[PDB]
């Protein structure tokens, strides 16, 4: 039914930038709230960025303000995380996720994609 | 999974989530009444 197929992780040197992809299948990215969450090995998952479905407001964790930008391309039906000025602790598996109708509970997540910062 | 006063714990993502993302909902998490009632 609904899937979130991720790509765009890989290795990057401290200071670098990277662009993550999360292609929706079975729904329209523009119609729901989506956010990005990440998990470094040894740590619990961490919310990082998000778009609110109801009004397209964007939000960002403190560790990531000024460096990261969430967005959607309606034509490609994908959510992106532009990540700039990367640093060692930004290293995790990144996960996109989708909320139910009317700013509902998260109901699906992507498979993950690994970001490694030397 | 106890988290800060303006977030709730999502079970699908095993992560704590800003309440603003659920505030406009009919049925928001209870731990987002106080915060969510800044509007």
Author numbering:
A (entry chain A): 1 to 118
B (entry chain C): 5 to 43
Q: Which sentences from the paper describe this structure?
A:
We have created an antibody discovery platform that addresses these challenges through antibody repertoire sequencing in transgenic rats, called UniRats, that produce heavy chain only antibodies with fully human variable domains, termed UniAbs™. UniRats express UniAbs due to genomic insertion of large transgenic loci accommodating the full repertoire of functional human VH, D, and JH genes, while endogenous rat Ig expression has been silenced by targeted disruption of the IgH, Igκ and Igλ loci with inserted zinc-finger-nuclease constructs. Furthermore, we crystalized a UniAb VH and found that while its structure is similar to conventional human heavy-chain domains, an engineered framework mutation and mutations occurring during in vivo maturation reduce the surface hydrophobicity of this molecule compared to typical human VHs.
The insights we obtained regarding the role of the W101R mutation as well as our observation of an increased frequency of hydrophilic residues in the CDR2 and CDR3 loops in UniAbs were further supported by crystallization of a UniAb VH recognizing human BCMA. An overlay with our structure produced a RMSD of 1.5 Å, indicating that the UniAb VH adopts a similar conformation to the conventional VH. Strikingly, a comparison of the light chain binding surface of the H2L2 VH with the equivalent region of the UniAb VH revealed reduced hydrophobicity due to several hydrophilic amino acid substitutions within the CDR2 and CDR3 regions as well as the W101R framework 4 mutation (W109R in this VH). A Kyte-Doolittle hydrophobicity plot highlights the role of these mutations in reducing the hydrophobicity of the UniAb VH compared to the conventional VH domain. Interestingly, the surface hydrophobicity of the UniAb VH was similar to that of the llama VHHs despite the UniAb lacking the hallmark framework 2 mutations known to increase the hydrophilicity of camelid VHHs.
